[PDB]
Design a protein around this ligand. Structure first.
Ligand SMILES: NCCCN(CCc1ccccc1)CC(=O)N(CCc1ccc(S(N)(=O)=O)cc1)Cc1ccc(F)cc1
Ligand SMILES: [Zn+2]
Length: 257
């Protein structure tokens, strides 16, 4: 099965998922000098007031905080998007050390982690149908740097002890994802893919320029999770990021001057 180790990591994924070598793969390096300001882009609309979190799950490659997406409760619209995209889950990618962990890079800089808020286009009815479409998903990516603690992340950090191993889940109601957003919604956007198998080319990526700060203690708790299941040899869940992929025939657009 695919993963992040030497024998099953990103350089191997193409054997089971040939789209790994496709024309719109993610993540990518964001070259800030080449990204063009697009005055036609609209401000992003992040409407999370009615978000309903339900559960947190260790799925063996990250942890997902899952939301009720049976109604338009937490939605992303505007920006580069046409239509309405419903929040289904968020998760992170992070490193073994603070100098790596993000999937996107900025002028080749790697951040300590990257948060992905995953949304699907309601015109396709369900997430499984949406991933089959080139405009099916919108993922909002937010970089994490290590410095001051992020108060709105602590409730996530403190439940991780309860989902240490693959397949464990825990009730996770009443979590407000607005507490994970930076001040500015300035962003870069480009067409890309899921960054884990099946690597489907169905994502409009929206990557915020402003990182959030988390504390060393917060990210250290991410790094105590396990890729393995209970009662299996311990493999710390670290370095669960895919490196930057070729940009090919794509333009990254900036919402800001
Ligand atoms: N236990 C989790 C096991 C890993 N993986 C199994 C999927 C899979 C299917 C076929 C073959 C291989 C693997 C996760 C999963 O199931 N997802 C999440 C999809 C996803 C969302 C966001 C990003 S990201 N990092 O933000 O770009 C990446 C990926 C739901 C889904 C639902 C319906 C689909 F048709 C496809 C995926
Ligand atoms: Zn992700």
């Amino acid at each position: 099965h695919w993963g992040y180790g030497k024998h099953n990591g990103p350089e191997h994924w193409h054997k089971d998922f040939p789209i790994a070598k496709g024309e719109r793969q993610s993540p990518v390096d964001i070259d800030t000098h080449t990204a063009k300001y697009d005055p036609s882009l609209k401000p992003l609309s992040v409407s999370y007031d009615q978000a309903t979190s339900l559960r947190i799950l260790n799925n063996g490659h990250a942890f997902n905080v899952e939301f009720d997406d049976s109604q338009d409760k937490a939605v992303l619209k505007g920006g580069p998007l046409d239509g309405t995209y419903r929040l289904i889950q968020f998760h992170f990618h992070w490193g073994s050390l603070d100098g790596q962990g993000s999937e996107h890079t900025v002028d080749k800089k790697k951040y300590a982690a990257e948060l992905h808020l995953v949304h699907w286009n309601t015109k396709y009815g369900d997430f499984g149908k949406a991933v089959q479409q080139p405009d099916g998903l919108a993922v909002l990516g937010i970089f994490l740097k290590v410095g001051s603690a992020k108060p709105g992340l602590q409730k996530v950090v403190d439940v991780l002890d309860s989902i240490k191993t693959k397949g464990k889940s825990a009730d996770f109601t009443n979590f407000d994802p607005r507490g994970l957003l930076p001040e500015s919604l300035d962003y870069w956007t480009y067409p890309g893919s899921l960054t884990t198998p099946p690597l489907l080319e169905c994502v409009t990526w929206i990557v915020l320029k402003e990182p959030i700060s988390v504390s060393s203690e917060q990210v250290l708790k991410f790094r105590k999770l396990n890729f393995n299941g209970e009662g299996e040899p311990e493999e710390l869940m670290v370095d669960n990021w895919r490196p930057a992929q070729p940009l090919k025939n794509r333009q990254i657009k900036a919402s800001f001057k």
